[PDB]
Design an enzyme around this catalytic site. Structure first.
Site, PDB file in Angstrom:
ATOM      1  CG  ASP B  51      -1.712   1.231   1.637  1.00  0.00           C
ATOM      2  OD1 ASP B  51      -2.360   1.848   0.415  1.00  0.00           O
ATOM      3  OD2 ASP B  51      -2.291   1.536   2.548  1.00  0.00           O
ATOM      4  CD  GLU B 130      33.434  12.832   9.231  1.00  0.00           C
ATOM      5  OE1 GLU B 130      34.425  11.965   9.481  1.00  0.00           O
ATOM      6  OE2 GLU B 130      33.401  14.205   9.687  1.00  0.00           O
ATOM      7  CD  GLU B 132      28.779  15.409  15.111  1.00  0.00           C
ATOM      8  OE1 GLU B 132      27.930  16.142  15.666  1.00  0.00           O
ATOM      9  OE2 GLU B 132      30.090  15.953  15.541  1.00  0.00           O
ATOM     10  CD  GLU B 213      31.992  14.179  18.101  1.00  0.00           C
ATOM     11  OE1 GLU B 213      31.782  15.482  18.345  1.00  0.00           O
ATOM     12  OE2 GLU B 213      32.962  13.887  17.272  1.00  0.00           O
ATOM     13  CD  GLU B 221      31.640  10.953  13.759  1.00  0.00           C
ATOM     14  OE1 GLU B 221      31.991  12.165  13.801  1.00  0.00           O
ATOM     15  OE2 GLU B 221      31.936  10.052  12.937  1.00  0.00           O
ATOM     16  CG  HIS B 270      30.591  17.333   9.817  1.00  0.00           C
ATOM     17  ND1 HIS B 270      30.689  18.727   9.966  1.00  0.00           N
ATOM     18  CD2 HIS B 270      30.566  16.702  11.277  1.00  0.00           C
ATOM     19  CE1 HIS B 270      30.667  18.897  11.200  1.00  0.00           C
ATOM     20  NE2 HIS B 270      30.719  17.762  11.981  1.00  0.00           N
ATOM     21  NE  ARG B 340      37.336  19.087  12.960  1.00  0.00           N
ATOM     22  CZ  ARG B 340      38.640  18.603  12.442  1.00  0.00           C
ATOM     23  NH1 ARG B 340      39.690  19.433  12.390  1.00  0.00           N
ATOM     24  NH2 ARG B 340      38.602  17.318  12.026  1.00  0.00           N
ATOM     25  CD  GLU B 359      34.250  18.116   7.537  1.00  0.00           C
ATOM     26  OE1 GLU B 359      34.568  19.018   7.764  1.00  0.00           O
ATOM     27  OE2 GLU B 359      34.324  16.813   8.085  1.00  0.00           O
ATOM     28  NE  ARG B 361      32.723  21.860  10.091  1.00  0.00           N
ATOM     29  CZ  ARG B 361      33.229  20.906  11.035  1.00  0.00           C
ATOM     30  NH1 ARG B 361      34.057  19.967  10.323  1.00  0.00           N
ATOM     31  NH2 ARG B 361      33.057  20.873  12.299  1.00  0.00           N
TER      32      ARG B 361
HETATM   33  N1  LIG Z   1      38.458  11.401  -1.667  1.00  0.00           N
HETATM   34  C1  LIG Z   1      37.326  11.172  -0.813  1.00  0.00           C
HETATM   35  N2  LIG Z   1      35.815  11.297  -1.342  1.00  0.00           N
HETATM   36  C2  LIG Z   1      35.028  11.417  -0.267  1.00  0.00           C
HETATM   37  N3  LIG Z   1      35.151  10.962   0.747  1.00  0.00           N
HETATM   38  C3  LIG Z   1      36.216  10.839   1.448  1.00  0.00           C
HETATM   39  C4  LIG Z   1      37.361  10.829   0.446  1.00  0.00           C
HETATM   40  N4  LIG Z   1      38.432  10.502   1.273  1.00  0.00           N
HETATM   41  C5  LIG Z   1      38.006  10.059   2.456  1.00  0.00           C
HETATM   42  N5  LIG Z   1      36.690  10.350   2.463  1.00  0.00           N
HETATM   43  C6  LIG Z   1      35.639  10.148   3.676  1.00  0.00           C
HETATM   44  O1  LIG Z   1      35.322  11.077   4.344  1.00  0.00           O
HETATM   45  C7  LIG Z   1      35.106  10.628   5.661  1.00  0.00           C
HETATM   46  C8  LIG Z   1      36.056  11.475   6.718  1.00  0.00           C
HETATM   47  O2  LIG Z   1      36.469  10.813   7.708  1.00  0.00           O
HETATM   48  P1  LIG Z   1      37.625  11.413   8.182  1.00  0.00           P
HETATM   49  O3  LIG Z   1      39.057  10.803   7.556  1.00  0.00           O
HETATM   50  O4  LIG Z   1      38.148  11.130   9.743  1.00  0.00           O
HETATM   51  O5  LIG Z   1      37.985  13.003   7.980  1.00  0.00           O
HETATM   52  P2  LIG Z   1      37.794  13.916   9.050  1.00  0.00           P
HETATM   53  O6  LIG Z   1      37.444  15.330   8.600  1.00  0.00           O
HETATM   54  O7  LIG Z   1      38.891  14.079  10.167  1.00  0.00           O
HETATM   55  N6  LIG Z   1      36.450  13.510  10.022  1.00  0.00           N
HETATM   56  P3  LIG Z   1      35.993  14.799  11.142  1.00  0.00           P
HETATM   57  O8  LIG Z   1      37.005  15.193  12.106  1.00  0.00           O
HETATM   58  O9  LIG Z   1      34.858  14.553  12.077  1.00  0.00           O
HETATM   59  O10 LIG Z   1      35.622  16.017  10.403  1.00  0.00           O
HETATM   60  C9  LIG Z   1      35.149   9.321   5.636  1.00  0.00           C
HETATM   61  O11 LIG Z   1      34.336   8.569   5.324  1.00  0.00           O
HETATM   62  C10 LIG Z   1      36.323   9.059   4.622  1.00  0.00           C
HETATM   63  O12 LIG Z   1      36.447   7.788   4.043  1.00  0.00           O
HETATM   64 MN   LIG Z   2      33.761  16.883  10.275  1.00  0.00          MN
HETATM   65 MN   LIG Z   3      32.147  14.411  14.581  1.00  0.00          MN
HETATM   66 MN   LIG Z   4      35.642  11.843  12.366  1.00  0.00          MN
END
Ligand SMILES: Nc1ncnc2c1ncn2[C@@H]1O[C@H](COP(=O)(O)OP(=O)(O)NP(=O)(O)O)[C@@H](O)[C@H]1O
Ligand SMILES: [Mn+2]
Ligand SMILES: [Mn+2]
Ligand SMILES: [Mn+2]
Ligand SMILES: Nc1ncnc2c1ncn2[C@@H]1O[C@H](COP(=O)(O)OP(=O)(O)NP(=O)(O)O)[C@@H](O)[C@H]1O
Ligand SMILES: Nc1ncnc2c1ncn2[C@@H]1O[C@H](COP(=O)(O)OP(=O)(O)NP(=O)(O)O)[C@@H](O)[C@H]1O
Ligand SMILES: [Mn+2]
Ligand SMILES: [Mn+2]
Ligand SMILES: [Mn+2]
Ligand SMILES: [Mn+2]
Ligand SMILES: [Mn+2]
Ligand SMILES: [Mn+2]
Lengths: 465, 465, 465
Positions: B51, B130, B132, B213, B221, B270, B340, B359, B361
Site C-alpha cells: 500500500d 559523518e 553523530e 563526541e 560517532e 558532515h 572547522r 567537507e 558541514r
Molecule cells: N576522496 C574522498 N572522497 C569522499 N570522501 C572521502 C574521501 N577521502 C576520505 N573520505 C571520507 O570522508 C570521511 C571522513 O573521515 P575522516 O577521515 O576522519 O575526515 P575528518 O574530516 O577528519 N572527520 P571529522 O574530524 O569528524 O571532520 C570518511 O568517510 C572518509 O572515508
Molecule cells: Mn567533520
Molecule cells: Mn564529529
Molecule cells: Mn571523524
C-alpha cells in the site's frame, strides 16, 4: 490423511491426549480433550458425545446430546500443550437423525461449497482473509451500576511517550496512524510475528507474509495464502488461535475487535475471493480491470446483498465504530481497481489470470468465517444467476449520497437480513431457522444490552444539562 | 550478487523469512517480512505489492498499489532477528507504468548518478557521511493543551553529578562540551560502539573508526568509509539501523536529532565528497589547498545553492537550533582548509591526491541521505557547468555580515528551494512535483504545527507581563 | 415590576453588581455581570451588547454583535454572590433589525404563547415540570484513544455497603430502586432539599414539595407549582441553577442527565399541562377520566407528534438509555388515568376541575424548557385544530406491537422532526431555519461523535472474537 493413518500416527508417536476443536455459532473455538483410547474408527463417523445445550445458539436442555466428528486432514500437534497432543477440527452430528447439524457453521460452510458445485458455474471458490489485530500489554474493563471503563495498553502506544518505564522509557513509540511500517526500534513485534507465522505453518496453514499495521500501540497483520471455502475458514480459526496463544506465551494479549482504539485505524478482515473451474480462473477476462462478466456479476451480488451480508461479516455493535464514514471506509457500496476507499477493490495483478480477484473490504475478524464465507459465496452466485449489474466503477478518493451505503448499526444489518435472506435460505445452505436464531441471539445478547448501558462520552456531553 | 545467487543462498541456508527494507519520503526506513516461497526471480523485476498510500508523501488512497523491488547486492542476515532472516534494500516500482517511481528517494538517488555519467564531467561521486548521535538511557516527552515537556537522560549526563544512583554514583560524568574524547571510566560507550561498528560491517558497510563526541550525556560517532552515491545512502541507512537496534539490545535509546541538548554540541552529519573519472581523483590540483579548478567550482555550486540545499540536508525545525550563529557553526557560507568554523572545509590530506575532498558541514542526520546526496551532487555539477566562483577562502575563527549566511528556519530553507530548484528539476533527477510535495509536507506537518505550540521558555520570559 | 422600579431598587439598596442571565440553544444558562451604572432605562429596550458567535447554535463570527434585554419581573438577589448582586433573565434582541432574535429559545417560547392567544382556543397554558436529579459526591470521566471511563459516587450508593469510610461506614445505603422514600438515616438529603426548595422560593419560584427518589445513590426531586409557558420555563432554569449551586455550596455535584446509573431509575421530567380561558379550566369535562373533548384532542396532538417532540423533549443520546422498553417506560404512545407506565397520564384530581391535566411522561431535564414547552403546546393546539383522536386509553401494566412506539435513538427523533415539523414552523413559533440548525447541531456534535467512540461494554462482549 485418513481415519486409520491418524490412528497409526497416535500409536507410532505414543500420543496420550487428543484435542478436538469446533466452532460455536457466534465464532469462538470450543474444545474437549480425550485420552488416546477414546478415539477409534467409529469416532470418525458416529462422533464423540457432548452437551449441545451449553454451546451458544444451539440445542435446548431437553434435547441436549450432540456429536463431535473430527476431520483426519486437520490432525497436527498442538504446540501449546506441554504433553504431546494431537489436535483435530470437528463438524457436529445430530445423534437423533445421524445427519450433520443445520446450526453447525462448519456444516453450512460445506453445504455452500456443495451448492456451488451443484450450479455448474464453478467447482472451487478461493477465499483469502486478511485479519488485522492488536497486540496489547494490558486490558482492564468493567461496567457496574455507577461505572463503565476500559483501559488498553501497549509499549508502542503513543499515549505513553512521557511515561516513566522500568529502566527506562526507550522512545520509538509509533505515532497515531503511523505504524505502517517503520523498522525496529519502532516495530517491536518482528520476532513474535515470525513465530506466529511459523507456528501456524506447522499447524497446516499456507503462510505468506507479516507486517506492522497503521495503528500505533500494537496493530499487526499476518499474511496467509487463499484456500477452498471450508479449508480457508479452518485456516482463519487456526490463525486466530496461534496468534492469541503465542501472545499469551510472551505475556501479551491479542484482540481481533474492529475498533478498540479511538482516533486510530480499526482492525478489518479484507476478504479476497475468486471462482474457478477445471483449474482455470473464471474471473479473468477483457472487461473492467481485466475481469470477466461473471466476476462483474459476482461483485453485483456482493454489492446488492452487502447490507444483509454485514449481519454475518460485521456482526458486532463495535463493527460500526470502524464502518464509519471517513475513518477509513469502506462505507460506500462500490467496486474499483487500486482504490482502497471502495467496498470492493480489484487488486492490480501482474497480468496474471490466476491472480484476478475481488477484495470485499467491509468484513472484520469478529465474524464466524464459516458463516461469513458461505454468505459471501451465496450473494456472489445469486449475482451471476440474476445477473446483477454492479453498476459503474468509482475511481476517486472523497454527491456522496448518490452511492448506496452500508448499515450504520448491528440492528440495521439484522433488519437488512430479515428483508433479504432468500439468497442464503432458498439455496438450503442457511436454514430459515438459523437465520431467525441469529437475529434473535444478536438482538437479545448484544443490541439490547448495549442500548441499556450509559456510555462514558455521555458524561462528557451531558453531565451539565 | 545476482537474483539467482540470493535464491540459492535462501535454499542452501534454509532461510525461512525475508525482510525487505525501503525508505519513505521524510527519511524513515520501512519494512515488510515474507516467507521464503514468496520471493522468486520475478520479485527482482516486477516487485512485490504493498500500500503506497500509508507511506508519507507518496500515493493517494484511490491510486494506492505499489511494488517493492529488492537489490540482490544488499542481501545479508539481519542480526536483530531471532529467526535467521535475509534482509534486502528495495527501490519502488510503479505497477501502472512499470517504471521506477518518481517520488522514491532511492530512484532519485540513482537518477542523480545516471545524470553525472551523462555530463561527461565524471563517472563516480564518492560520499562520506559523518553522523553523530546521542546514546540516552531514558526519553519522556509530550504536549497537551496545558503542558509541553521533554526529559532526556544519560548516566554520562553532567546534570547527574549529585544524584543518588543504584549502588551508587560512580562519578566520571563528562563535563558539558568535554566528551571528546577522555578514556574510561568517563567514556562508558567503548564496548557498545565497537559492537555497533562490527555488526554494521557484517551488514556490508565499509567501517573505519569510532569515538565519543564533544557533548556530555552520550554523544557518540562511528566512522565509515566513503562509497558511490546510492551505496553511501544505503550505508547511512544501515548505520542508523544497527546503532538504534544495538542500543535497544542493551536497553538504551538513540537519537540522530540535531539539537536534543541545550548549551552543548549538536549532532551534525558532515559530508565529504569528490568526483572521479577512470579511477583518477578529479579534485586534485595545484590551486587553493591542493584542489583543482573543478573542485573549486563544485564548492561554488554547493555554496551558491546552500540555502536551497538546506531544505533537504537540514529538513527539521530542530536543525536550526544547531545551525545558530556561534554554537558551533557552520552558519557562514565559505570554504577553507583546516577551519572547522566554515560551511565547506577542505581537510588536510597527507599529500595524497586520492584523499582530496570538500567537507560540507551544514547537514545533519535528520535528512533522507538519498535526497540530501542527490541534491548536493546537482548543486556541485551546476557549479562546474556555470562555472560558479566560490569566492575567496576565509582562514579565520570569529564584518561578519560581509559573508552570506544560511537560512535561520525551515520555512526560510523551503523559501530558498522555491526560488532556487532548477539545478535539481531541470536535470530530471527531482521532479517539480516532488519538490512541491516536499515543501507542502514540511509546511503542513512541521512548520505550521510548531508555530501553534507554546514553548516552555515562553513561560520563563512571559508568565509575568 | 417595571424598569424604573428595578432601577430604584438598585439605588435604594446600593447594589453594585447586576447579573444578567440568558439560555443558549441546547439549554445551558449563560451570564454576564455589570457594574450598576451600566444599567439604565435603555437597557430594558435596546439591550446590552455581547458576542452572539460564542453562544452555541447562534450567530457566525462575521455577524456576531447581539443584545441582552433583561425582564424587570425576574429581578431578585442571587444568594450565591458574596457581593449583593441583582439577577435578571434576558431575551435576545437582533441589533441589525431591532426585533427579537428567531433563534432565542425565550423568544420562541413567548411566540408560542402569543400563537395560543391568536387561535381563540385559550388565553393561558399552564406547565408543571417535574425534574428529578442525582446528588453525587464525586464524578470522574474521560475518554482518550486507549480509554473510556466514568465513575459516579455517592455515600447513599448501594455499591458502597462494604467500603471503609472515614470514621466509619454508617450503613443505611438505600438499595437499588429502593430510595422512594424511606426516612433518615437512609435519606441523607432532607436538610439540603429544604434549602434548595427555600432558596429557589426567594428567587420567585412557586414551591410545593420535595422527596428522595427511587434510585439509590442520591436520586432526588423537588416539587414546584405550575405557571404560564415562559414563566414555567424561567422557573425550571432557576430550579436547575439553585439545586446545582446549593450542591456546590455543600461540596456535592448534581446531574440532570437521564441515565447516569445502569440498572436503576433514570431522571425524567414529567410535564403536566392544561389550557385555560377567562380563568376557567378547559380540560374539565364529562368524557374519559373527567376530561373534555378539547383535552382528549390536545393529547391526540401530543401522541401523534410525540416522535418529533422527542427531538426537543429528549434531545440527547443518553435520553434513549432511559426511554428503553421495560425500565421504566414511557416507551408506549398512549394515554391512561393513574397508569404510570403510559406516555400520557391523567392524574386523579379530587373532583376539582382546576386540577384536571395531562402528564406527558417522556421528557427529561436535558431539554431546553423554552423549546420543549413551546413544541408540546404546538402539538397540543394542532391536535384540537385537526381534531386528532388520541385513540382509546390503555389501562394495563405489561400484542405490545399494536401500540405505536417512541424513537429508539436521537437520530430517529431528528428523522421524525424532519418528516413532521409543520405543526411548529407553519405556526411561525419555530422557524424552518432553527429546526434545520437544531438537527445539524445534534448530528454533528452528539450523534456522529458518539458513533465514533468505542463503548467499554464492547470489550465485555467483544475482546475475545
Ligand atoms: N576522496 C574522498 N572522497 C569522499 N570522501 C572521502 C574521501 N577521502 C576520505 N573520505 C571520507 O570522508 C570521511 C571522513 O573521515 P575522516 O577521515 O576522519 O575526515 P575528518 O574530516 O577528519 N572527520 P571529522 O574530524 O569528524 O571532520 C570518511 O568517510 C572518509 O572515508
Ligand atoms: Mn567533520
Ligand atoms: Mn564529529
Ligand atoms: Mn571523524
Ligand atoms: N485468485 C485469488 N483468489 C482468492 N484469493 C487470492 C487470489 N490471489 C491471491 N489471493 C489472496 O488474497 C490475499 C491477498 O494478499 P495480498 O497478496 O497481499 O493482496 P493485497 O490486496 O495487496 N493485501 P492488502 O494490501 O492488505 O489489501 C492473499 O491471501 C492472497 O493469497
Ligand atoms: N391544572 C394544572 N395544569 C398544569 N399543571 C398542573 C395543574 N394542576 C397541577 N399541576 C402541576 O403538575 C405538577 C404535579 O405535581 P403533583 O401534584 O405531585 O402530581 P403528580 O402526578 O402526583 N407528581 P408525580 O407523582 O411525580 O407524577 C405540579 O407542578 C402541579 O402544580
Ligand atoms: Mn492490512
Ligand atoms: Mn496485506
Ligand atoms: Mn486489503
Ligand atoms: Mn418523580
Ligand atoms: Mn411528584
Ligand atoms: Mn410524574
Amino acid at each position: 490423511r485418513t481415519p486409520q493413518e491418524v490412528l497409526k500416527w497416535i500409536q507410532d508417536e505414543n500420543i496420550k491426549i487428543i484435542d478436538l476443536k469446533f466452532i460455536d455459532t457466534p465464532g469462538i473455538w470450543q474444545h474437549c480433550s480425550f485420552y488416546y483410547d477414546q478415539l477409534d474408527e467409529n469416532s470418525f463417523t458416529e462422533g464423540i458425545p457432548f452437551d449441545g445445550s451449553s454451546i451458544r445458539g444451539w440445542k435446548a436442555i431437553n434435547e441436549s446430546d450432540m456429536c463431535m466428528v473430527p476431520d483426519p486432514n486437520t490432525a497436527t500437534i498442538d504446540p501449546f500443550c506441554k504433553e504431546p497432543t494431537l489436535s483435530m477440527i470437528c463438524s457436529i452430528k445430530e445423534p437423533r437423525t445421524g445427519e450433520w447439524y443445520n446450526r453447525d457453521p462448519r456444516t453450512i460452510a460445506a453445504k455452500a461449497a456443495e451448492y456451488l458445485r451443484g450450479t455448474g458455474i464453478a467447482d472451487t471458490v478461493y477465499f483469502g482473509p486478511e485479519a488485522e489485530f492488536f497486540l496489547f500489554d494490558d486490558i482492564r474493563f468493567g461496567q457496574t451500576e455507577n461505572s463503565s471503563y476500559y483501559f488498553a495498553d501497549s509499549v508502542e502506544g503513543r499515549w505513553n511517550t512521557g511515561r516513566e518505564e522500568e529502566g527506562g522509557n526507550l522512545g520509538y513509540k509509533p505515532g497515531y496512524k503511523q505504524g505502517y511500517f517503520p523498522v525496529a526500534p519502532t516495530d517491536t513485534a518482528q520476532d513474535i510475528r515470525t513465530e506466529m507465522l511459523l507456528t501456524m505453518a506447522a499447524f497446516g496453514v499456507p503462510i505468506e507474509k507479516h507486517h506492522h499495521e497503521v495503528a500505533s500501540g500494537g496493530q499487526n497483520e499476518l499474511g496467509i495464502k487463499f484456500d477452498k471455502l471450508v479449508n480457508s475458514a479452518d485456516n482463519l480459526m487456526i490463525y486466530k488461535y496461534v496468534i492469541k496463544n503465542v501472545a499469551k506465551k510472551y505475556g501479551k494479549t491479542v484482540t481481533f475487535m474492529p475498533k478498540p482504539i479511538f482516533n486510530d485505524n480499526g482492525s478489518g478482515m479484507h476478504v479476497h475471493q475468486s471462482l474457478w473451474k477445471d483449474g482455470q480462473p473464471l474471473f479473468a477476462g477483457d472487461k473492467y480491470a481485466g475481469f470477466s462478466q461473471m466476476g462483474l456479476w459476482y461483485i453485483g451480488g456482493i454489492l446488492k446483498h452487502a447490507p444483509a451480508l454485514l449481519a454475518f461479516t460485521n456482526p458486532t455493535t463495535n463493527s460500526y465504530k470502524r464502518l464509519v464514514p471517513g475513518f477509513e471506509a469502506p462505507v460506500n457500496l462500490a467496486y474499483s481497481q487500486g482504490n482502497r476507499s471502495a467496498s470492493v477493490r480489484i487488486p492490480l495483478s501482474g497480468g496474471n489470470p490466476k491472480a484476478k480477484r475481488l477484495e470485499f473490504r467491509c468484513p472484520d475478524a469478529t465474524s464466524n468465517p464459516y458463516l461469513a464465507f458461505a454468505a459471501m459465496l451465496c450473494a456472489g452466485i445469486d449475482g451471476i444467476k440474476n445477473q446483477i449489474d454492479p453498476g459503474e466503477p468509482l475511481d476517486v478518493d472523497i454527491e456522496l449520497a448518490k452511492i448506496p451505503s452500508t448499515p450504520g448499526s448491528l440492528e440495521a444489518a439484522l433488519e437488512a437480513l430479515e428483508k433479504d435472506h432468500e439468497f442464503l435460505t432458498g439455496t438450503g445452505v442457511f436454514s430459515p431457522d438459523f437465520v431467525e436464531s441469529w437475529i434473535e441471539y444478536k438482538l437479545d445478547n448484544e443490541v439490547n444490552p448495549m442500548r441499556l448501558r450509559p456510555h462514558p462520552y455521555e458524561f462528557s456531553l451531558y453531565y451539565d444539562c
